[PDB]
């Protein structure tokens, strides 16, 4: 229909005409190529649709209006705001209790789009009381009671209530949602698992107290299991959540190790999916920033050759993540752990990466080389290391960096030349 024909039917004194026009609006807003959301907004139709959500008698017009509003709220922030400004948040929360599962599901979906817009609308959905009726829909002993698409919508909408920063979701809300999240994290549906992992990944990004809340729930072993799933949509958020947890305290990081996560990293650090391999390298960088006994577990799982491999060949951003992982290792490791890096072949790929002109990565590499030399000094191995650096062309690079423009680069390279190559 044209928008005029929709307005005429919506503004008739005939309810069947109103349902027909609302249906035509829902189809127009669902069409593949550029649905006319703004023309529908300018026509003043959102208040009519919100009014229809309250027509408990005429469930077909409730469903059609909920679908039409869902697809407006799927748009820009300004389009989502027009839906909120029409009073839709409390009207959708009221619809969660509908005896018709497909209408309740549509309200869940719309609330997910609204909360997904950002932290202010997320917190406004929470303030209107959406969490209690949403969790009540999931408070059954067997989750396979519920339709698969229904369960996926509830999980996704809950994940958007856990999402976003500045500010993070209210503590009381996260505490109330978490136990249901833990159940969904064990449910045997791939999309439910994926969005459960996304929710946990959101909750674990922040101050270490936020990590602690999640880890206290016993979730890390299941996250490590999902780390090994064959579905990339599951591995991606599972690895994100694990990566967030190891940015925390040493004890939080130890829970990831004790659950067996390191055994998965030979595959993760060679994964052909670029973002998986890069985030696994970042995760290793925060583990090698841990205790010496945690570095030793990296060693024991055979992961140092894999970090040598990533540094040797990967896309440039990933190689730089690996350089950070190495510099952290050399900053906190024992002398024995550090010279083991050299035995595994770290020097040549470090010197190869020093061809980069970026001031930032140069300093990272020079710091790692300085830390390795300091360990070699305690063992009496500096001459071996110097020969190794010269033979792969690394001395040429260092020597030329004595004339770099940046003072931090120029003084670090001078210092290496004076101490070890005179």
């Amino acid at each position: 229909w044209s928008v005029e024909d929709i307005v005429k039917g919506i503004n008739s004194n005939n309810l069947e005409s109103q349902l027909q026009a609302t249906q035509a609006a829902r189809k127009l807003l669902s069409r593949e190529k550029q649905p006319p959301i703004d023309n529908i907004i300018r026509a003043g139709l959102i208040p009519k649709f919100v009014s229809f959500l309250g027509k408990t008698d005429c469930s077909p017009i409730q469903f059609e209006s909920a679908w039409a509003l869902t697809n407006i709220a799927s748009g820009t922030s300004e389009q989502t705001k027009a839906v909120v400004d029409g009073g839709a948040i409390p009207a959708f929360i009221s619809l969660l209790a509908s005896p018709h599962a497909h209408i309740s599901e549509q309200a869940v979906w719309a609330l997910g789009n609204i909360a997904g817009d950002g932290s202010a609308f997320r917190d406004l959905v929470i303030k209107h009381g959406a969490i209690d009726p949403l969790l009540a829909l999931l408070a059954v002993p067997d989750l396979s009671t519920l339709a698969c698409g229904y369960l996926r919508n509830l999980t996704w909408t809950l994940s958007n209530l856990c999402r976003n920063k500045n500010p993070a979701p209210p503590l009381d809300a996260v505490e109330q949602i978490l136990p249901t999240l833990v159940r969904l994290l064990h449910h045997n549906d791939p999309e439910v698992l994926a969005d459960s992992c996304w929710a946990i990944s959101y909750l674990t990004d922040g101050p270490n107290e936020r990590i602690e809340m999640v880890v206290k729930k016993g979730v890390v072993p299941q996250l490590v299991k999902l780390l090994g799933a064959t579905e990339l949509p599951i591995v991606t958020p599972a690895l994100r959540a694990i990566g967030n947890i190891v940015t925390g305290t040493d004890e939080q990081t130890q829970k990831v190790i004790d659950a067996g996560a390191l055994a998965v990293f030979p595959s993760l650090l060679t994964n052909p999916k670029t973002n998986i391999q890069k985030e696994a390298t970042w995760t290793m960088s925060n583990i090698t920033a841990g205790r010496q006994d945690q570095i030793q577990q990296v060693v024991n799982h055979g992961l140092v050759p894999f970090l040598v491999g990533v540094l040797s060949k990967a896309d440039f951003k990933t190689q730089k993540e690996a350089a950070w992982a190495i510099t952290n290792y050399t900053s906190g490791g024992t002398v024995e752990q550090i010279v083991y890096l050299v035995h595994c072949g770290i020097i040549e790929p470090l010197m190869n990466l020093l061809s980069a002109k970026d001031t930032k990565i140069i300093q990272v590499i020079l710091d790692a080389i300085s830390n390795i030399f300091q360990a070699a000094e305690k063992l009496g191995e500096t001459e071996k290391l110097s020969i190794m650096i010269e033979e792969c062309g690394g001395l040429d690079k260092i020597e030329a960096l004595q004339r770099h423009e940046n003072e931090s680069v120029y003084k670090a390279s001078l210092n290496l030349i004076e101490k070890y190559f005179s």
Binding site: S30, E32, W67, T70, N71, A73, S74, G75, T80, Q106, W109, G112, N113, G116, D117, W156, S159, N160, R163, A194, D195, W198, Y202, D205, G206, T236, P237, R240, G243, N244, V246, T247, G248, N275, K278, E279, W282, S285, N286, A289, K317, K320, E321, W324
Partner: peptide
């Protein structure tokens, strides 16, 4: 020191994966 996701995202965006934010019903 540990480095949080915000710093990884500043190094690596755009394209760092995230869950679906909004969904259109077809």
């Amino acid at each position: 020191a540990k480095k949080k996701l915000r710093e990884y995202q500043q190094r690596n965006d755009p394209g760092v994966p995230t869950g679906a934010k909004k969904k259109k019903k077809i």
